[PDB]
């Protein structure tokens, strides 16, 4: 093959979800060195996999109701904040589908905002209501994501200039994507490279291998992740530009193998933002630099 797999089960730092801040700070030194070393982060979390492969499971069922039905929230229809990414439900249009850069994007898929788990503005939590097994799981893996990333965030922090600000990611800001893959037919592709705009991400363990990440010297690897308990922190544009350019994004890419007529791939990730009204900075030159712009402005100006 020419992309090799990259076991990480036994070879990233264990986190325990019971004891999240004193096991994160004894990984620091290791995901430093993997951040250095790969240009993406990793870490065991015991436990994750079920929780989030259930949590998943209900996302598949809800895709397949016939009432309540997920099409009944899409994002058009969902309430949204003034100030905002766009929550709920991003149906698959055959006719006419939606593009990722340009290419056509082979998914359905959910935004679920902390706003929307605190049903805000009002009636975005319809969806969790509509569909409370999922709702109810959703809610539990944004807010181990959000633990978990919170921290990786402290860690990036850590090894930029002293005077970096804490990174202040906003819970409503924050977005778990839950995604089930569909239409593929003979793709092989099912997202070209890229990076996440925000200021991290974390993937939790998906259904099926293809996710794929590049190394500082171009080397795609594929991380052995599905069925596993192992999470990966991706850096985003708004910290690489917070960074001065220091961090890569954590370019990534989804490949799949052919399966069964419509085999149920899923995947979820955390996109983990700060407020989108917050002044922008970047450490330049050892010190804090504030701009005008605002991350919110980040977002727009791409
Ligand atoms: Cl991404
Ligand atoms: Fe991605």
Same mark, same amino acid.
């Given at each position: ?21 004193? /096991? ?18 990793? %870490?065991?979390?015991?436990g994750i996999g079920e929780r989030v492969e ?10 397949? %109701? ?16 003034? @100030? ?15 593009? %990722?850069?340009?290419?056509? /994007? ?5 935004? @679920? ?23 109810? &799981? ?6 181990? %994501? ?36 569909? /239409?593929?037919? /003979? ?18 363990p ?14 795609? @690897? ?5 069925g596993t308990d ?22 990534? &890419? ?14 979820? @990730? ?33």
């Amino acid at each position: 093959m020419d992309v090799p797999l990259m076991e990480l089960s036994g070879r990233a730092p264990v986190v325990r979800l019971h004891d999240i801040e004193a /096991d994160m700070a004894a990984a620091t030194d290791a995901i430093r060195s993997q951040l250095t070393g790969w240009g993406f982060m990793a %870490a065991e979390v015991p436990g994750i996999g079920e929780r989030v492969e259930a949590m998943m499971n209900e996302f598949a069922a809800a895709c397949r %109701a016939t009432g309540p039905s997920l099409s009944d929230y899409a994002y058009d229809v969902v309430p949204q904040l003034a @100030v905002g990414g766009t929550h709920g439900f991003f149906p698959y249009n055959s006719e006419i589908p939606r593009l %990722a850069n340009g290419v056509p /994007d082979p998914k359905e898929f959910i935004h @679920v905002s902390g706003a929307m788990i605190g049903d805000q503005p009002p009636g975005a939590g319809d969806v969790l209501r509509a569909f409370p097994a999922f709702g109810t &799981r959703a809610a539990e893996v944004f807010d181990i %994501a959000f633990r978990l990333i919170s921290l990786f965030g402290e860690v990036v922090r850590g090894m930029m200039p002293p005077g970096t600000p804490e990174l202040d990611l906003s819970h409503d800001a924050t977005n778990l994507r839950v995604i089930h893959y569909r /239409d593929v037919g /003979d793709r092989e592709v099912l997202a070209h490279e890229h990076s996440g705009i925000q200021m991290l991400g974390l993937q939790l363990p998906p259904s099926d291998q293809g996710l794929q990440y590049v190394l500082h010297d171009g080397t795609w @690897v594929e991380p052995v992740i599905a069925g596993t308990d192992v999470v990966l922190c991706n850096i985003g544009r708004m910290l690489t530009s917070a960074s001065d350019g220091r961090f890569r994004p954590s370019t990534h &890419r989804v490949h799949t193998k052919p399966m069964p007529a419509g085999y149920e791939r899923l995947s979820s @990730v955390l996109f983990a933002y700060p407020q989108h009204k917050a002044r922008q900075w970047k450490m330049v030159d050892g010190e804090l630099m504030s701009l005008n712009a605002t991350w919110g402005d980040f977002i727009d100006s791409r």
